[PDB]
């Protein structure tokens, strides 16, 4: 079962997180993808995030700052990113995969995700350390 790497991408004010919705599920989650072959974790993240939203994380990523979870036999490592422009025109660079890319108010997700029609993946299980990291970034 191949490891998956992706990114929790926050805006400059640390108020919003950028989530993606695939074309085959209504769940919102981090831009992310599988290890291709022998590439390291950060290069995987940079490549997959660029494919899904068209933004290059090379100069934003820190290999020390991530949240790691094992789910259904899969290791997920989600790198923590801040300072990304809210006016960047995100768009997928691969076909038929990503339906929507949208900024979400982070505080609101934490207060609503349990009583909402909106579906999420991964971010539900990472909310506590995400929240701590956000506080720490201030």
Give the residues lining the site for Mg ion (CB under 5 A).
Answer: 33, 48
DSSP string covering 111-126 = HHGGG-S--BSSGGGG
CB of 14 to Mg ion, least distance (A): 27
Q: 71, exposed or middle or buried, with CB in 10 Å at 0-12, 13-18, 19+? A: exposed
CB of 97 to Mg ion, least distance (A): 7
CB of 99 to Mg ion, least distance (A): 14
Cβ-closest position to Mg ion: 33
Q: Closest CB to Mg ion among 33 and 92?
A: 33
Q: Closest CB to Mg ion among 48 and 81?
A: 48
Q: Residue 98 has which token pair?
A: 């990503």
Q: Closest CB to Mg ion among 95 and 135?
A: 95
Cα–chain center distance at 87: 17
């Amino acid at each position: 079962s191949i490891p998956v790497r992706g990114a929790a991408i926050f805006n400059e004010n640390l108020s919003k997180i950028l989530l993606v919705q695939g074309t085959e599920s209504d769940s919102w989650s981090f831009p992310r993808g599988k290890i291709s072959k022998d590439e390291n974790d950060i290069d995987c993240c940079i490549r997959e995030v660029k494919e899904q939203i068209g933004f290059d994380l090379t100069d934003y990523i820190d290999d020390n700052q991530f949240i790691e979870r094992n789910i259904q036999g899969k290791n997920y490592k989600i790198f923590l990113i801040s300072g990304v422009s809210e006016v960047f025109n995100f768009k997928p660079q691969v076909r038929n995969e990503i339906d929507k890319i949208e900024w979400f108010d982070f505080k609101k997700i934490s207060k609503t995700m349990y009583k909402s029609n909106i579906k999420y993946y991964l971010i539900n299980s990472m909310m506590r350390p995400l929240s701590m990291w956000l506080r720490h970034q201030r």
